[PDB]
Design a protein around this ligand. Structure first.
Ligand SMILES: Cc1cc2nc3c(=O)[nH]c(=O)nc-3n(C[C@H](O)[C@H](O)[C@H](O)COP(=O)(O)OP(=O)(O)OC[C@H]3O[C@@H](n4cnc5c(N)ncnc54)[C@H](O)[C@@H]3O)c2cc1C
Ligand SMILES: C[NH+](C)c1cc(NC(=O)CNC(C)(C)C)c(O)c2c1C[C@H]1C[C@H]3[C@H]([NH+](C)C)C(O)=C(C(N)=O)C(=O)[C@@]3(O)C(O)=C1C2=O
Length: 368
């Protein structure tokens, strides 16, 4: 093993960093995960994730966690609707497709990963702020906590990682769209009309440049997203004030059936975020002081409009761990390089599809 008298620091305990830690730990490699979250019960905001056969599910299979993923995940139909609430198309789960890509809740996935690892693999309340290369080890700086050291740092700390300079100078870019997200609890009570329009399936509608998506059953909460081209005026809506977000959305959704408006009216709080991409446009630095790399959204953040996200990141996990597993290479450096080479190819394919589908969907006359 290349890592024999060494240790690995994974920065970030997302699904990709925790899968990374598991695939390494089952090969006897000494890894820690350093996670900003205060403790393992912190709520992860967001929709559900779906792991695909051939990618995500391969990583889970390699981890021995596939069946656990299946047990906790929920396959779902898809309804496409118009702005008037007409169902244009219903695609139900067929028994033979049940396992293709079942929806799992993000805390549920994290709990599966965390349970899979040895005790104290993950070190909570650790926010990496600085990285410094030493003689033979990285020194790792964490806000108000002891510093630590590692032979190999894997950055897994998501799309907005601030500690990427030693791998690449490339910067995150805005793509021109924007997403507003929210949860509604007791959706059967609080948005009955909309809840009944979803009728146990996911829901998508498209009208005049505004896209609505919803999953009515993320562990009992409805999660919806509203996406659109960033208005040129923007920020001129304040996501801390629910009144200004409501006003903006009721204006944009004036044309839409009352059931969708009710959705907006009953939401307590909204999260706004500009869509971003970390583009795989140019090779990463070949001159590097010590072995360091990136996986997941740290490596290839891309728009979430073709289901590309976590799966390609799980594949990074699989490919990197296989590579670091063997004496197949002469050096950690070579193992990292080979991984980075494959990831550029399937990464860039994914980003091309995200971008392309993003262009496609926000064409004024788009129809699902
Ligand atoms: C609105 C939206 C919808 C999406 N829908 C889908 C979808 O349906 N399907 C899909 O596959 N993908 C989807 N994605 C993308 C998906 O969420 C990401 O690909 C996935 O979560 C990336 O996993 P990750 O582990 O690389 O990063 P993350 O999930 O971002 O996790 C990074 C982890 O690092 C921790 N961290 C951050 N900074 C630090 C630090 N300095 N020190 C220590 N720890 C740190 C964070 O706490 C977080 O725990 C969506 C994305 C968005 C924005
Ligand atoms: C083209 N759109 C419609 C699309 C396509 C695919 N599938 C593919 O691209 C598959 N690629 C093939 C066709 C196999 C080559 C898709 O897989 C998806 C989507 C839509 C998104 C919407 C995402 C959204 N994000 C942007 C916040 C969101 O709010 C929700 C939600 N439930 O509230 C989503 O579900 C969303 O995350 C998501 O998962 C999408 C798709 O999965």
């Amino acid at each position: 093993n290349l890592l024999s008298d060494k240790n690995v620091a994974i920065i970030g305990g997302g699904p990709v960093g925790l899968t990374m830690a598991k695939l390494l730990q089952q090969n006897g490699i000494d890894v820690s995960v350093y996670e900003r979250d205060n403790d393992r019960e912190a709520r992860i905001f967001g929709g559900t994730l779906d792991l695909h056969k051939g990618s995500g599910q391969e990583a889970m299979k390699k981890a021995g966690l596939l069946q656990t993923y299946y047990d906790l995940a929920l396959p779902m139909g898809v309804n496409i609707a118009d702005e008037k609430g007409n169902i244009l198309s219903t695609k139900n789960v067929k028994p033979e497709n049940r396992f293709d890509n079942p929806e799992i809740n993000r805390n549920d996935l994290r709990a599966i990963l965390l349970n899979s690892l040895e005790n104290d693999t993950v070190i909570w309340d650790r926010k990496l702020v600085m990285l410094e290369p030493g003689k033979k080890k990285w020194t790792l700086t964490f806000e108000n906590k002891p510093s630590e050291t590692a032979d190999l740092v894997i950055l897994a700390n998501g799309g907005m990682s601030k500690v990427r300079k030693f791998v690449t100078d490339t910067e995150v870019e805005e793509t021109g769209t924007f997403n507003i997200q929210a949860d509604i609890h007791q959706p059967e009570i609080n948005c009955p009309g909309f809840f009944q329009l979803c009728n146990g399936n996911r829901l998508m509608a498209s009208h005049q440049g505004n896209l609505l998506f919803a999953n009515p059953n993320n562990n009992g909460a409805l999660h919806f997203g509203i996406s659109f081209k960033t208005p040129d005026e923007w920020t001129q809506v304040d996501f801390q004030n629910r009144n200004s977000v409501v006003d903006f959305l009721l204006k944009e959704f004036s044309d839409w059936d009352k059931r969708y408006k009710e959705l907006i009216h009953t939401t307590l709080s909204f999260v706004g975020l500009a869509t971003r991409i970390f583009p795989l446009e140019k090779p990463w630095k070949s001159k590097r002081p010590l072995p360091i790399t990136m996986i997941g959204d740290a490596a290839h953040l891309m728009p979430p409009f073709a289901g590309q996200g976590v799966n390609s990141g799980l594949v990074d996990a699989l490919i990197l761990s296989d590579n670091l597993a063997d004496g197949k290479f002469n050096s950690i450096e070579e193992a990292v390089k080979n991984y980075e080479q494959q990831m550029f190819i399937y990464g860039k394919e994914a980003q091309e599809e995200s971008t392309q589908n993003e262009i496609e969907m926000f064409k004024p006359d788009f129809t699902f």
